[PDB]
Amino acid sequence: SLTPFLRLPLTDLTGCLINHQTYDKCGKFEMKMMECFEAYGLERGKRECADLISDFQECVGMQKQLMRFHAMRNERYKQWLKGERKGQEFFADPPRVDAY
Amino acid sequence: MFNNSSKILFITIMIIGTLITVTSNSWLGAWMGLEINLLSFIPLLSDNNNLMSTEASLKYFLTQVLASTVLLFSSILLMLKNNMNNEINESFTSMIIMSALLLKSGAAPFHFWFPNMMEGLTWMNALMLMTWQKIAPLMLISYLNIKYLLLISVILSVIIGAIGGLNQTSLRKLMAFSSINHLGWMLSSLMISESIWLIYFFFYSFLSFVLTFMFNIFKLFHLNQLFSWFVNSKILKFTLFMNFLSLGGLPPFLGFLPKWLVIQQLTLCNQYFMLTLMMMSTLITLFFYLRICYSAFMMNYFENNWIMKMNMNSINYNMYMIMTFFSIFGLFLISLFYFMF
Amino acid sequence: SLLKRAWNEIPDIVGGSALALAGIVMATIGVANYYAKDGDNRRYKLGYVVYRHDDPRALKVRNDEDD
Amino acid sequence: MWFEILPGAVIITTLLSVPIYAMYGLDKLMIGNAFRRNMDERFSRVMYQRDFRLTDNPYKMNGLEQIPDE
Amino acid sequence: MIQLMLYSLIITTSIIFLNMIHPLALGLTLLIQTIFVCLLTGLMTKSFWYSYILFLIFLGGMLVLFIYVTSLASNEMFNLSMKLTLFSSLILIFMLILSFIMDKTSSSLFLMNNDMQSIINMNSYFMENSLSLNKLYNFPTNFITILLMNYLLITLIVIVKITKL
Amino acid sequence: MFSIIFIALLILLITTIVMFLASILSKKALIDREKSSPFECGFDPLPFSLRFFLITIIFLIFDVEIALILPMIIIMKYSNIMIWTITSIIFILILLIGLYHEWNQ
Amino acid sequence: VITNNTTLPEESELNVQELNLSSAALRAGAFHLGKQCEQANNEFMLCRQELDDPRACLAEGKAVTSCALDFFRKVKKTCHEEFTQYATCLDKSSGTMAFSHCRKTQGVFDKCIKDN
Amino acid sequence: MIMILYWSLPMILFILGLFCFVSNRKHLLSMLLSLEFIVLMLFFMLFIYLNMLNYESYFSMMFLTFSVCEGALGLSILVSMIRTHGNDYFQSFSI
Amino acid sequence: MFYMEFILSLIGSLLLIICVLVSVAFLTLLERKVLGYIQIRKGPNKVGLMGIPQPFCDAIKLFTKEQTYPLLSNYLSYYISPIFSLFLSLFVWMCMPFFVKLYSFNLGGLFFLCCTSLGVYTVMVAGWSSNSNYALLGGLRAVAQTISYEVSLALILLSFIFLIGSYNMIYFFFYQVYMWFLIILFPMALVWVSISLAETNRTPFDFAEGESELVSGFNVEYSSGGFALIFMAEYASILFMSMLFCVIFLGCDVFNLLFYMKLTFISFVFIWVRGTLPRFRYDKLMYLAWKCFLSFSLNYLLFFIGFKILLFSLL
């Protein structure tokens, strides 16, 4: 989060407006980043606290999971276009409707 | 500008919106405060007696809402890439954020709205425009760590803001072009400190209050109008015009101090070529300051003789003469100052 | 007087202001009645809420009869 | 005299009574259950999903005869 | 699939918004874009509250000013061209058959709906449009909506001054 | 919502088909100079009004204000009671004071 | 996310006879199910809420499923037609399965349970 | 990648509305209507951002309030020139 | 997902549309008949038997007459107003409280406010495209009154939603199982009648679409099928306001035949105030919509804020 220049009474309302702290899949990850930004500050927290930054961005940004999903779907279509996979076995056994 | 209490209401809400902008810990509450500041700065900069003020408010609206939506779009893009407000390695979305801030502030690739709007205003809304409305974008520019955009903006500000003020004989466009050059000294101070910028901005603001009060009380809008200005003693007109030499950065007066602190901090930060590029392009600013000073440095003029009484406000000129004294004798207070360190 | 003029010209606004004053009074009455008892600890929780006996919240549960 | 309005009004009472009552027949014809399942709360949608998972007709009952003897 | 249909409709209405010049016709293009934007933001969300809020605020509330100003601005009627209608229909049928020949699972949005969430999620079963709107009326974010109502009153005060009445 | 799109497109399609068949069923006569004329009573033939524009602006400000009064029915059983009451009483009271002040001035 | 390092349970451990009842057969007879099966439901949901691990307290989930199956088999032994009529009236009563639309067969079901 | 497949279209239509905002072949009313087009695209992109988080969608009516006040402000700026510049200022291609 | 839900939803919606349209025709018959009986005179008669196929005589005539245009060159904008007007009047009925499920509208009041907020849009394109100063004046007057009581209607229905605790229209049924809301909300009943005669142009609020101060507000150039679609859309709005009065105040009672008897009675009340009251003025209607009804709305909304807080502590 951005460090404001001035710490007046007028940052008290703006500060809580967006935050993963309200119930969320991994706000407990963000807290583990945010307290780290209390420890080293904002600028040393960019270097000394890089492992906890990437987990929160991985969780809520959903980057490598969606990239892995698109790698698994494009490889299946490449195998379909290259003739390795065809017919009724193009798609696997579907999950149950209440599985997830 | 105090014809109504509603304008005092708009002044305090634009102060509130600017303070919401500069204290926001996220990139979206800053945009919220920017919209509050915009809402309260649309009715100021608009009046019924002046025809050009309405189209100048239209230019201000289109320029700011073009800059605010690009600022919002790039901040949402940054939040979509990395979900914290900061960024580990700087990329193009910070460049779009900084360019949207430079359209708000008036840096020289994006400054062409600034004197074209300034050509049709009064001298108090100009005082709000070049001083308080530079608070909200410049305090957000300090959150970014890209160097070459600030380098291009500083270089273009000090050449374009100094050369472009030579042709202008209107005082408002000349002061706008002088504020564009003094903007570039503020962004050059922003790459090296967040306190030397406050020093330069506070005393540049002080010089803006004391110099725009000379043109607001006596209603001066032209270079030729300064020659016809009647002062009862020509020594007083010569003394009152030392604020131009003060703001141009001359050593015995104040106004040499913040430029000198920028020089001291930039040389200590091993940046010598950009400092030389600014100071070879600040002599032109003193040249169109000294072209104003043709109307007072000589001691006798071919005056028009129909006006023989100097008419002035009491409270405003009482506030003016305090600040004129500290604009030229304010270097004695360097021993009392402790905010440089 | 002043209330006679308001009751003569604008009687619906006077009646609405009486209703709004009554609603404000019984809103403060409802807030005081909610916070006089343990209104923050509702009797009927949503979801499936379980507490073990070591938790401090398990000692604050309500054993009242169903109304 | 004045009872000629009731030709023009009671018909209005009949026609607007049509789009529910016919459905109260029609849901008893092709479904067999007179009421379609309410999709307001999420728990009702999840349990309707469970019924359509269990049987191809979600309004077909899985009673106690489904339970094997043990 | 219908998300891709709304993508295609928004693309077609945007390119005809770029093409046309008559101001009430751009206002009509905006009012028919707002419906598709409302539905498409309804596809990502748990429930359709904010689409309704955007609908009442933008279309039925705000754009009627734009429709009134653009109606009194232009004396003349629309010059309907069958060429632009044919080009819009051709690019629309092309983009729908392009969505037919494209896998919709990879093109679907990653944002979870109310039924895309987990079954063991406790918060989804409570009340529709409850936890998202909760922070509007709780400490310490209620000062923003108090400031918003004050901002709307101050906006009306600004508008009365700048139009000069 | 996907069924709502289908039924709204069906209502639009049915109304356009009914109007197209009405245009076919309409009696086509010879088109005239005076028949196409805009109707002014009898003999053949407006500027911008600011009062109606501020009526639309007052409607817009009150509409965006109503859009913040809309959520709090749901939140009343899922929030702090004192905060909710303070915000609701303050919200409608400042609205009433602003309405009465704009009435008196 | 699931890799080869994570230890998912085998499908033979997951091959448990499940409660395959419909919504009307689960909504009806629920108030006698919860009282009879309160020892395992609370422990299993405490396992699900505390650890937040799907692989943990699988034995507790199996105990919940077996306890529900035992209660429904006990209902099937004694009071079958009354429960079938109660679930039928609960499903045909309204759209959502609301208990207030028919209370006539609920009393017969509670009378059967109280007598047996 | 993620940017190419997800949220690429609001960027493209935002640049199209920006180019319609600043083109010299349009007029001031077209600038204001294209401005509310990019307001709609900004709402689309902001809602795509805000729905990665679960229960922070309440911000969508804050940006709506600010941008609707911007639109009413722009209309009241533009129609304030009716009594001064006349009714023909809506067809102005340059400022 | 089970396909008979889609099939029965489609069948029920089309049956609702057909029955609403035939009830619109018989509502025009009822209005011409009992509106005559408001005075001494008789209603329609002598066509068919006892005047029953008189709206079909209207429908055969209006679908045969020459479709004239307000200008000869370009008139496609003239077409799009009755299409969208009848589309909204037949589309607003999907948020009717159906107990057998047709559409699970958990937010039905917002849907009603959306369709009412498009009513201004269809009457604005009705006014502008008809190329006449009378048409523009009537369109501006109708847009003025409908956005003036849009805010009031939103606040009144917003006060009603506080009673049931949610936005689901079927929740009006469970809170009316012991008594109707006509007992508790009788000034709200009079205010809601004044609201429902304002969004739909009827005689008490008729400066928009009257035959005295204008010849016709926005139907002045509309004829030969467009006037038929506009007339059917307006009477469907009357039927929707009668139903929405009968759901909120009178008990929803969707299945009972007494609910549809009360719906015909509230339509009779709408035709009863059609013959009685005179027409308001522009200044008095701006006084009514923004001061009296707005002040009553905010005040009695404060009353239900206090009452719902008071019952929350007691329950």
Ligand SMILES: CCCCCCCCCCCCCCCCCC(=O)OC[C@H](COP(=O)([O-])OCC[N+](C)(C)C)OC(=O)CCCCCCCCCCCCCCCCC
């Ligand atoms: C089965 C019923 C059969 C009979 C009825 C049949 C018809 C059905 C109902 C139709 C109703 C009429 C519809 C059209 C109305 C047209 C007239 C109209 O709009 O008039 C507007 C008029 C206008 O007000 P006005 O009359 O003051 O304004 C005109 C006078 N000037 C301009 C000079 C000021 O009335 C109102 O707006 C009244 C406000 C709403 C109603 C009152 C609510 C007040 C709050 C509740 C009571 C408060 C507590 C009181 C007790 C305690 C006091 C301390």
